[PDB]
């Protein structure tokens, strides 16, 4: 690779790596919020599912939940 | 849950969700850098592996690579 | 690696690879059952979740579901 | 769901679950082979990578490896 290409490549890697640091920082801050939640007596596993489903299409989730319950009852789950 | 707990919970979710937005922003910026890389004629799949292995312990990676080559040759790969 | 070790290594790889073939065969049969399910008018995505949760500890799942609902209501989801 | 549908559904779940048992059995046998490998002085992590790459397109893997090395040298890795 020529001098120009080498320069570009170095810049690309440097820039991604700087952004990966920022991403790591934000992940640590998210951890810290859950750590505070745990210390205030909340269930972190459940909190994480709250955040997770609050990103899903709520109609689709409730639709799928209804079909799930229908199937569970049809196979005779008690 | 009482009023206090409700307040805490809302704050927790709000704060995580704000951080998830920031994380999404940073992921988009990482995509954009690779998009620029692609437009300058680089191999994005390979770039991503450069970044990935540049986070690993390089002694361990080279050690494992050596043992790999040893095993491949022992089973007669050509 | 000496002759003995080479023999062992070849046997190891051969045996794992034969088992991976069997695993692939079983995965294909699982796909086929869901294909039959789809052709009989069932919702395969939901079927897959039925199988998935039918492997979980049902007390823990229902416990977590209860706490989830409690949190969702506390943050005022409607 | 009517009687017919209930019957079909039960059959579907039963059949998938029987296949998941077989899959579990095969996974355990794969573990056992690696356990034997470990007891004969082999590096299981490396063995697993041997099996993994022996499923990839070897031209594509070597092509990507070459481009990788080219990029690593261009950014001045030592």
Residue numbers in the entry:
A (entry chain A), B (entry chain A), C (entry chain A), D (entry chain A): 12 to 89
What do the study authors state?
GapR is an essential NAP in Caulobacter crescentus involved in DNA replication, chromosome segregation and cell division. In this paper we present three crystal structures of GapR from C. crescentus, crystallised in the presence of double-stranded DNA with a sequence from the origin of chromosome replication. In all three structures, GapR adopts the same overall tetramer ring form as seen by Guo et al., albeit with small but important increases in the diameter of the central channel. DNA could not be visualized in any of our three structures, but DNA could be detected in gel electrophoresis, indicating that DNA is present in the crystals.
